[PDB]
Each structure stands twice: as C-alpha cells, then as structure tokens.
C-alpha cells in the first residue's frame, strides 16, 4: 500500500503494533501489506479468496526465494481492502493483495478485525487474531 | 568516451544521498506560547477560580469597613495520554546516511507538539463563551472588531487571535492590513529575527497563525471529536477565535521530568530499535467568557 | 518427540519461538510435546480426540500433580504428528499423545497450523494459534 | 513496516561501494630478464654480425 | 573471493544475552549478515569427477 502526498509517494507502515514478527521464504514476489498463506515448508504465497489460507502480512517487498518478515497474529496492521469495511467487521484476504469482509466472501470466520474503517482501496487499520489453513 | 561520470554513475562513486532529511508539511506549533502553559504535579487536578473584582464601598468615617471576601470555584483537568512511536531494524538505524534515531525523537516530539496544538485549539474553540455570527457579510476585518467588541463588551481584554487560513483569507482583503503580522508572532520570533515593529492588529499583540489539520473534527485514526466545525466557507464554521493567552491553561503531566519523554528500547529477538514519546494534556478556560468565536 | 545424530537420540526442544509459557498443575504423568486441556482449576491432562480439549503443549517431563510449564498459542513448536502432515495444514490433538490433521479427525477447526511437513510419527514443525474448550 | 533495509535501500542510505577498486588480470613481464637488453643513445642504430 | 561481513552493531558476529524476569529465562542469539563474491571468477578453477 502507498500514500500520495502532493507529488509524493510515501510506503505506508504496515506494523502498528505488536511482534509477532516470524521470518519464511517467499514462493513468489511479495509486497508489503499483502496476505500471505504457507505454500511448502516455511515458504509463504499471496492467499487466495474464501480462506482456509492466512498466516500473516508480508511487512516488505521481496523477490521469489528471498528471506519475507510477515506480522503475525496479536499485530495491529494496516493494510488495503477491495470494498468499504466499518468498525468491528471481520475481514480476510480476497485473493487480490487485499482483504474482503467475511460477509463478502464464502468463508464464515475471518482473521483480522476493523479497527479504523476504511472505502474500497484505502489503508484500514485491522487486529490479526487468527491463523487459517487447511482443513479438508 | 574517456571516463566521465554518466558512464560510471553507480560504478566508481555512488550518487550523494544528503544527510539532511527534508520536512514534510509542518503544522503551526503554536500553544505554548498562545496559552498559559502549567506543569501540573498530577494527572487529574482543579485549578482554583477567584470570584469578578468588585468596587470597595463609599464609607462613613468610624463606620465598620463591610466583608466583600473574594469567593472560589474550580475547574477540573483530566490530562490525556499522548502517545506516538517508532520501530526501526538495527540494521536500518546502521546503515542510514541520517541519524534515523535524532529524526524519530524529532517526529515524536513534532507529533506530540501537534497533539498539544490540537487539544488546546479543540478547548479553545468549543468552549469559547461568546460568538460573532458574520451571516456571511463583512467577513475579515469587521468581524475581528466585532469579535474584539464581544469579549471587550463582557469587560475582559484579548490580547491574542487564533486564526485558520481561510479566515486569514477573507482578514487580510484589505491592503489597509497587508503590513499586519499575517506570518503569526510566533513563526516570525521563531523563524526569523528582524520583526517588523508596525504589525500588531486590533490591540492583539499575538496572532496564533494555526492550521486547518490542528482542529478536533474526530476524522483522525483515535481522536474522538469536537462539537464545531474548524473552517471559513460554510454557515456555522468557526473561523477564528479572540481570546486572553493567560484564561487559557494548557496543562501538561509527566510522570518523569515536566515535559516530553522520550523512551528506547532494543529488542534483542527481533533486531528492532523502537524510540517512544508520551506526554499527558488538558487544555481548559480558567474564563471562556474571555474569548469569542468567528462565525460564517 | 525424538531425533537422531548417528547412534544416538536426544530429546527434541519443543519450542522453537515464542513466549506464551504458563504454569499449570499435571492432573496425570505427562511427557514433552504432548497436548494438554484443563481437567481441573489450573490443572491440565492429556487431550482426547475430536477437538474441545486444547490448551497447549507440555514443555517438559512432569509426574502426577507436579507443575507444568505448557506452551500457549503464539508458540512455534516441534510436535510429532500421528499421520502425513503438508505445510499449512490444521493440526490437532490425536488422543494418543500426539497430532492429527482437522482433516482426519471428526472436529473441523484446529490448533497448530503445520509449518514443516512430516511422515506419520515424525516430528512437524507448527505453530500454536487456537484454544479449544468446552462448548456443550 | 518499521523503516528497514528492503524499504529504504536507496532513499534513506546509498549501498556501499568498495574504497578499493580490484585488478583486472595481469600479464607476465619477463623479457627485460629473457634478453640481451640495450639502452640505445639513439631511435636508430644497427648491430654488428 | 570475498567473503563480505555486515554487522550492524560492530565488526562481526553479535551475540546478545537476554534476561526474561517475567518467565527466568535466559537467551542466547547470535546473528551476521554474509555474501560471497569473487571479483575475477577466472581467478579459480573447479575440480570436475
Ligand atoms: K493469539
Ligand atoms: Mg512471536
Ligand atoms: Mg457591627
Ligand atoms: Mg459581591
Ligand atoms: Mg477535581
Ligand atoms: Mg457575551
Ligand atoms: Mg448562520
Ligand atoms: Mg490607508
Ligand atoms: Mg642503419
């Protein structure tokens, strides 16, 4: 996620608070703010809608096989979502860099909860609470 | 061709990274000086209230001088933590050509500043006592006056005026006022020396240049909101305040020392330096009546 | 849990990272690594199957009403799995000392995510993000 | 996320450039040595067989 | 061949002893940032069964 200030664009930070701060290897190229779910043995990929694929926020750009820091869950994050969040909705990753609210999605629990509401392409301020993975 | 720089640009030397940072936009710090500043012992407290001067009483020669004491009320404090922090790699505060740790106390403290500078502007505004409604007519110069004629007429001097930029739009219309101190008294003592000696307004020897961002609208990520709107385009916005810098008490509370604190810490898991400031802030009228608002 | 370098064994550190240890009181004899859940006030036994038993894992070796140090959710942990584990997959009490996958157990939502795959009896690595209690 | 290297690597610092500059392959100077070597008074000059 | 050694908090490998007066423990952690590089790869030759 970015930050436009006059002619300016500025990284927004994507760690409020917290430090659950747990190092993986990229499988792909990653961005910061991005979802990500494990895709191989401490190898982290870009999640997919409708859950059952969250660990964490990749907290800076990486090159595929590069070593990835992710905030985990018990960190405050800010991150970008593809539609309008209020306060207190449950959101996951949409599958596009982003998170959805859980009523958008066919997932019926998310990972993150809204602090700071935000519209659709803007930075919310979320809490990580949970981990998804799979399930069968 | 030769060896010129073009060819070996990232090769034999590296382009100048210049160890000053450049500020991003700096909002008008402006409290301390345009209200009475209290280091208060406390978190919460009460700062006592004298009862209006009265007139002593025309007496008979012989005759019993009359009890007219000077009688007391308070008003309440209840200091607000402030608090903004940084996190920085080890790695990071090592390799930066800046001092990453000097600018982070440096933001910390710009921020803190700003919280200070929002509180008292917050209090100044909602709970100034008197109003000049402008109705969108004589904006500028004829609602100062008349904002200046509301706190003289309850009996009590201004000596400051708190302004925002679209009121210093509509004052300052008039080329009569173009020598005026537009600048606010504390950017020219602070960022310059040689002030022009003309520049007072209205009797008021502090113009309080403030910025449209300062104000409490509770749009801000933990910021609740105040009861006006901070602004000079719309009915109803607030777009100056004429005021007493000393019935204004900005009360700052630190459990160390009497003003900001600054706070390290090394995480040895993580590898993160993170740098924090906190400082706890009221802002209250010790008289309200003292100052009245500019309406749209 | 146990690993091998040459003729010998020796015994697996059960964390790998984290903070999340507490103190509780053995309800039976318990073994490292093995899962555990409140049987009494602050007092934790092994966990049975198909979810509702799961407060952490045991970090050390403890006889019958001796205190316990459990590891909590936000614990990176090296436990042995009773079945093949893939990376991201849910794992959760076997009932027999060990972890199964959500997938093979009759519950639907687990406690550890699997962070380095392992064959059956091997040792995963996982992550510790959920409690399970009673819910009737 | 905090500032960090990946994040500021050409913004806040420049990556080092090494002070010493590291040889190329040389090449083996002998024939000062593996012969008769004369120092002539001029450009232009002839030996006698 | 250059073995490159980044440290930031000195020369070399850091180690950082950390008391938990929360929990007792004790940690150990040591870190340092390494690359390898040649500046003439025709500088070596590799042995090939
Ligand atoms: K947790
Ligand atoms: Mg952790
Ligand atoms: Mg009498
Ligand atoms: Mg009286
Ligand atoms: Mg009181
Ligand atoms: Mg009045
Ligand atoms: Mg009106
Ligand atoms: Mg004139
Ligand atoms: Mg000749």
């Known amino acids: 996620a970015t930050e436009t200030q006059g002619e300016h664009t500025f990284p927004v930070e994507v760690l409020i608070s917290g430090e659950e701060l747990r190092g993986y290897t990229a499988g792909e190229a990653l961005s910061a703010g991005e979802p990500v779910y494990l895709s191989g043995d401490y190898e982290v990929s870009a999640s997919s809608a409708d859950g059952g694929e969250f660990l964490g926020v990749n907290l800076y750009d990486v090159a595929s096989g590069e070593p990835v820091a992710l905030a985990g869950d018990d960190c405050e994050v800010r991150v970008e979502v593809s539609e309008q969040v209020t306060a207190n909705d449950e959101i996951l990753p949409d599958g596009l860099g982003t998170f959805e609210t859980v009523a958008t999605s066919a997932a019926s629990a998310g990972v993150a909860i809204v602090q700071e509401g935000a519209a659709s392409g803007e930075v919310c301020e979320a809490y990580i609470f949970a981990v998804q993975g799979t399930t069968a | ?296």
Not at chain 2, 105 to 114: P, W
């Open chain 2, 1 to 296: 061709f030769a060896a010129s720089d073009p060819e070996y640009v990232d090769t034999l030397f590296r382009e100048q990274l210049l160890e000053v940072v450049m500020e991003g936009r700096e909002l008008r710090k402006v409290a301390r000086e345009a209200s009475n500043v209290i280091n208060a012992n406390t978190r919460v407290g009460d700062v006592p209230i004298a009862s209006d001067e009265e007139f002593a009483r025309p007496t008979g020669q012989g005759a019993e001088i009359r009890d007219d004491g000077e009688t007391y009320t308070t008003v309440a404090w209840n200091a607000t933590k402030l608090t903004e922090g940084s996190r920085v790699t080890d790695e990071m505060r090592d390799q930066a050509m800046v001092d990453l740790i000097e600018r982070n106390i440096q933001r910390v403290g710009a921020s803190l500043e700003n919280g200070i500078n929002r509180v008292f502007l917050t209090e100044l505004v909602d709970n100034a006592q008197n109003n000049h409604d402008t109705a969108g007519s004589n904006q500028g110069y004829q609602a100062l006056n008349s904002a200046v004629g509301e706190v003289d007429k309850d009996d009590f001097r201004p000596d400051t005026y708190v302004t925002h930029p679209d009121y210093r739009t509509q004052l300052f219309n008039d080329t009569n006022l173009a020598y005026a101190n537009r600048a606010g008294t504390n950017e020219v003592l602070r960022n310059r020396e040689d002030a022009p000696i003309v520049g007072d307004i209205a009797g008021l020897d502090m113009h309080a240049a403030m910025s449209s961002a300062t104000y409490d609208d509770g749009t801000d990520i933990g910021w609740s909101g105040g009861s006006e709107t901070w602004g000079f385009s719309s009915d109803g916005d607030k777009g100056a305040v004429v005021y007493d810098r000393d019935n204004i008490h900005t009360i700052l509370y630190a459990p160390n020392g009497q003003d900001v604190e600054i706070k390290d810490y090394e995480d040895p898991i993580r590898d993160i330096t993170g740098v924090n400031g906190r400082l706890h802030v009221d802002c209250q009228y010790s008289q309200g009546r003292s100052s009245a608002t500019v309406q749209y």
